[PDB]
Amino acid sequence: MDVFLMIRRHKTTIFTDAKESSTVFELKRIVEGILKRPPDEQRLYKDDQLLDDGKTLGECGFTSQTARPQAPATVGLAFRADDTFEALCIEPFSSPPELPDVMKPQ
Amino acid sequence: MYVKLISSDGHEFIVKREHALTSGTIKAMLNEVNFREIPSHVLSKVCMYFTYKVRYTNSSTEIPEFPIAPEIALELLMAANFLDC
Amino acid sequence: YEEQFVTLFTLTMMQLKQMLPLNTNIRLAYSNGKDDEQNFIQNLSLFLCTFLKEHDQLIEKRLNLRETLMEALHYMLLVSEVEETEIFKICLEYWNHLAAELYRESPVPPRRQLYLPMLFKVRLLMVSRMAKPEEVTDSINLYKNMRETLVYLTHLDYVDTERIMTEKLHNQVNGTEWSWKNLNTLCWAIGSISGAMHEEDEKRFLVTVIKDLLGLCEQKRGKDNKAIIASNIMYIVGQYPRFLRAHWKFLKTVVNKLFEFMHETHDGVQDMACDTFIKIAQKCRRHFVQVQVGEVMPFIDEILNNINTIICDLQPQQVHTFYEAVGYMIGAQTDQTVQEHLIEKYMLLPNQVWDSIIQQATKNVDILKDPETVKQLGSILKTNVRACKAVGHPFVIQLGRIYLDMLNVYKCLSENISAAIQANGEMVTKQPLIRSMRTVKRETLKLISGWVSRSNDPQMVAENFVPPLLDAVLIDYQRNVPAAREPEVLSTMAIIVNKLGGHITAEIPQIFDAVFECTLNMINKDFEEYPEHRTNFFLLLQAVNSHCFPAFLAIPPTQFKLVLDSIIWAFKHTMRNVADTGLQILFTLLQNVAQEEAAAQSFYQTYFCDILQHIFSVVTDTSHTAGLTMHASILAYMFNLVEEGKISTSLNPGNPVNNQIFLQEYVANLLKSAFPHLQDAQVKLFVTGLFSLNQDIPAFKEHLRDFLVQIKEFAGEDTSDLFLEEREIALRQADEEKHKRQMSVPGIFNP
Amino acid sequence: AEVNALDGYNRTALHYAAEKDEACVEVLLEYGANPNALDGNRDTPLHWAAFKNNAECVRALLESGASVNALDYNNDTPLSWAAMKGNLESVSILLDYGAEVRVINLIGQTPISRLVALLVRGLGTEKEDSCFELLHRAVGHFELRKNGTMPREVARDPQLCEKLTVLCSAPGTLKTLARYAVRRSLGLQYLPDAVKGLPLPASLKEYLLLLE
């Protein structure tokens, strides 16, 4: 079934969709289409855990009920620099402001 | 194919153009768009909304609820007003 | 003597105050008091009602009495609390009088302001305890009286009436006043209002009431409550066809709901359902055949598509009511071709069953000797009859399909009946199979009579339909044993003659030769031994006389003499209807015979002295004085005919003396032999009056009245019944004035 | 008087006042009639005021602390009774006190379902249409397909069936979903006074009140 993913690296974030039976390799191919970074110099992380391009997204633990459009699975992305991979870095989305008192829970 | 939206805190969200045209304001305004006034936590949710609105448009099945956290609700309302969604 | 009536009341009212204080519970006093107390209360109600009926004006004028009159009216409300049918009826009569008075005053005026500040109490009371309408005698009486009273009170103030009913309906939904009785009576009142309000206020009121009742139908659980509520709903909705025409989608919902109730099984719900469905289809018929706003096809076509399902559970008379309702709907389609296709689809199921049975019969007629086969034929023909009644003339398209087969079935069943009788004696009658075949025969004749009476092409009927009918029916009627003679044969022949005047004339001889003498000897003894055959026979005779008098001239003279003899017996008969129809037939024949004077002379010479003898016999007997003016009229006719010289002949039998000089002697003879105590001078005077007033029919009637009155005076007998024919008309006049009055007020007559 | 005393019908006097006029309701509430008082079915005075559409009585009750989401043995809220008659004034007042629209009674009917039912029966005036519009704005989104299919009564009215099925098959604008989440967060208080302090454009302040 479907999977909806957010691929994230530093400030960047790509929304995308894939079949559960698809593999991380064509996800990298999508990353190629957007950022033109050859597959070998990009690595992808599920949680603080890396993967293998060949494995099918299903065995990566992505699943339709896991990866709804309204709550995609986050995937970390990193590139080589000087032929060496950067450390995974991802800026948090700025935290929401204080909830107004009139809206505060009863 | 893809269109790039920039948040006020400088995050850069890439989305499918067919999804981005869900926004009327995007449709009028446009392969890059820069938002001076929307924070990343809101705009990311807005792009989730675009993906949801596409994937459940004219849905035969019952549409699942869109989860909004109360804290971001008040800023999502404005952002959806400005973006005319 | 106005002041006497005023003082009588004032002082008696004073005395009544010491008797019953205004705070006293009159209903309680009636419930606990000894019989003298109930009598006293009833006499009070009678006194107040009659007094005010005559003199309310008088106490209205004497303004110094105003509050004492008001006080009396308070007692009028308290006595109205009494439930005892007679006292309540008296109070209701007073309220009806008052409501009529104030509706006349203005349909505020100077007086109505007297009553209006508490007439709402009359309203509340009237609505609270409404008598049962025929939601399904004293019943009809009270119901009608109170319907008019409430319609008047509403037309006097619509707002307070709607307010009261909506409050009581809420207090039903509230449960505070929930009771099957209170719900029924309230919904009766709501239905009885029907049509008194303007269509927009009716629309608002019914929208509120329907929303409330549907809420109560959700809230209340238990099939019993659910069904009572359903019935009250069906009632209210049926009574408001205007609202249903204004709200097509609501009508469609109601109809689908009724087709749901037709599959219920709780008690009478299916009967109430069918009755409401037919009450709608009669009044909304056009809406079902129109393509309504936003419809793709007319609803009639949906109904005929669902018909096989809709009736899956109905009882036979319910099926007949359903088919009649659909007939009324199809009867609105004005396009002959579209209505043709509607009728074909409509009758498809009965036609299929009929075809099946006929096919079995042609395979072997022995299938007709089977209770199931004959009962299915009976029910099929009942449905066809009801369809023909509702659809009218265009139903010919169906009738011409089955006609010949139907008569063949009729023939075969007649053989069986004859065979059974000749096998086993006349008692076979009332045997259930025999009753079934006779029912099939009666239904065939009812169907033919219905269509022919509704048909409007005499030439087509005379060409294609009559000859097979007469072949099948007449010889059968002749040779059957009297119990095996259906009076519907006579009725059908009468209807055919009344329609196909002249075109049937060639058949009248064989009609009479088959039915006349056979049936007359069944009828001309006493009474009650064949009252149906008697009635239909005289209807046949009157019809044939009026439309086909020439057939009497063509008919052989012996049977025409028998006809005259039967007419003589008929008007001489004691019973009012037999006598009246005899007189009518006699006068019609006498009017006919003056035309086509060929062989009229033989007729006159043969019959006049005999007819004249019998008419003077019945006149002097005064048996049925209700005929006297008719007698006078016909008497005057002969005394015209003879005095005009139309006889043109020495009517004195075989003798030279001319007419009139003979007749005045003949009448002198019969009168003197009737009244030997009456002097020849009085005979001369009376007969001179007769031959003077012969054109002065009202004066002739008064002269005859006077001469009979003075005969009774000689005898010392009662004279007053001679005048019944006058006061009956006066009574009828008052009734028609009442009727004519009611048409001026919307909602007194049912929609 | 024992204003909270049940009579023999087991209804409070406030259940009568809520059915007649706001002056009685105010008198009883001022004298400390329990606005949550429960009759023999639990139905509060507020349910009856809503069902009678006594708009000013419904106000006078809510403004004195009646539980806007009070439940009877059916779990009908007062809005489930206002909506079954489609009566606009009381629905509007209840929604201004943050009455919940996503409620389901034990039979399984929401207020919108009851109003759609009333519309299918063709008794709906422009007032019922306005009420259905107001409820569709208040709810943000609703669903009526059961097993992909409209309730059998709705299928009898093709124009309404098409309207409702298209309304169902649209995921709803993000603007109205945000409006619903904000209203939900404001909770059981007088919304058109709680929203005034919010940091929003005044047009959005009015939009939150379903006036747009």
Ligand SMILES: *[C@H](CC(=O)OC(C)C)n1cnc(-c2cccc(Cl)c2)n1
């Ligand atoms: C009552 C519910 C019911 O089914 O009663 C059972 C069968 C006894 N009810 C709800 N709605 C209606 C209704 C609506 C329009 C027209 C009619 Cl005739 C009835 N009845």
